[PDB]
Symmetry: none
Subunit: 104 residues, 2 copies
């Protein structure tokens, strides 16, 4: 797919920005700030649905959007065999969805 | 010589948004997929600069972008007297690439 791949002949491959996707709260923030727990989401797909760590989170936010949460606190993650299981409980900040421009 | 008036494509609209909420990777994915440790960011605040967990997330994303990591991992966001100390490690996908092809 596409052209120009660039082999590993370049010893130094540096990339800044690249539009990050970082957004979640840990056990501390939940207990400290007292967030709004909006339920639970869990991944349970057949093996090759997740080709990389990128795939995983793309399916996590996918479920989070359907829920209407702002963060998800992952509690369990294992391969249960041919199926991959990742369980995360969903939290919102102090209200329903911060940053009032993400509606689609 | 064989004139056949064929081929009609009414293809319209291809919107690339997918801009959701709630992302980031946790401990299990890091240890499982073996993610790229790109460093550690410490959010050191004094007084009431941060009002909500949202603002913390803002600063976490701010620092991670400039570090070259897509996801952070909060290991301890706590208060230190008049100061606020949030310790988060920065991780990038085990591939160093992105969802886009070629920029450099």
């Amino acid at each position: 797919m596409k052209k120009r791949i660039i082999a590993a002949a370049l010893l130094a491959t540096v990339a800044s920005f690249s539009t990050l996707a970082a957004e979640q709260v840990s056990k501390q923030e939940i207990s400290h700030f007292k967030l709004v727990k909006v339920g639970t989401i869990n991944v349970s797909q057949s093996g090759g649905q997740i080709s990389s760590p990128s795939d995983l989170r793309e399916k996590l936010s996918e479920l989070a959007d359907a829920k209407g949460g702002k963060y998800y606190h992952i509690i369990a993650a294992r391969e249960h065999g041919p199926n991959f299981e990742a369980v995360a409980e969903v939290y919102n900040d102090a209200t329903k969805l911060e940053h009032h421009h993400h509606h689609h």
